[PDB]
């Protein structure tokens, strides 16, 4: 996986922070975005984020995923 890679949400992922569905369960499955970050460490110091893949979508919306929930496009 690389920062900048385009990906499609293949697994079902229900979120509540989407700008057009605030506080409401919304499945991201099928949406496509760009990888903005892969959380592993902060200033060389290893972090333990269990949803390391940060994906940015349109509408100023971003969300975190496991490597297995998205597919390289």
């Amino acid at each position: 996986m690389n920062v900048g890679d385009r990906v499609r949400v293949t697994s079902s992922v229900v979120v509540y922070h989407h700008p057009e569905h605030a506080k409401t369960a919304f499945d991201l499955q099928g949406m496509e975005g760009e990888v903005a970050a892969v959380l592993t460490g902060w200033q060389g110091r290893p972090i333990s984020a269990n949803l390391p893949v940060l994906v940015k979508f349109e509408q100023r919306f971003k969300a975190h995923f496991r490597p297995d929930e998205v597919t390289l496009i």
Partner: protein
């Protein structure tokens, strides 16, 4: 400790989530969050093992409310539970006394 108590109660109501049926569980996590905020400055999740607690704090992924909870309403600690969860009680508040009892018995 009191600020952490208020935080949990308000967030629980804000997200329509509930505390564990057994408030002692809730108490332990709140006390742990309070503890971490003192030593680290941030409410780092206390129910996990970190290699660099200070780095984790700077990244913020695990600062309560964590990314999984803010995005997926997922709290592996069992602090904020969805209504359908078997361990979810109907309370969104916890007596201050309950917490005090935890400070009393730690070990």
């Amino acid at each position: 400790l009191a600020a952490m108590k208020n935080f949990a109660e308000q967030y629980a109501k804000r997200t329509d989530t509930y505390f564990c049926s057994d408030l002692s569980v809730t108490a332990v996590v709140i006390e742990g969050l309070a503890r971490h905020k003192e030593e680290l400055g941030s409410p780092l999740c206390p129910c996990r093992h970190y290699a660099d607690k200070e780095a984790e704090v700077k990244n913020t992924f695990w600062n309560c409310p964590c990314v999984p909870m803010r995005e997926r309403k997922e709290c592996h600690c069992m602090l904020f539970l969805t209504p359908d969860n078997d361990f979810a009680g109907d309370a969104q508040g916890i007596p201050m006394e309950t917490l005090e009892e935890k400070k009393a018995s730690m070990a």
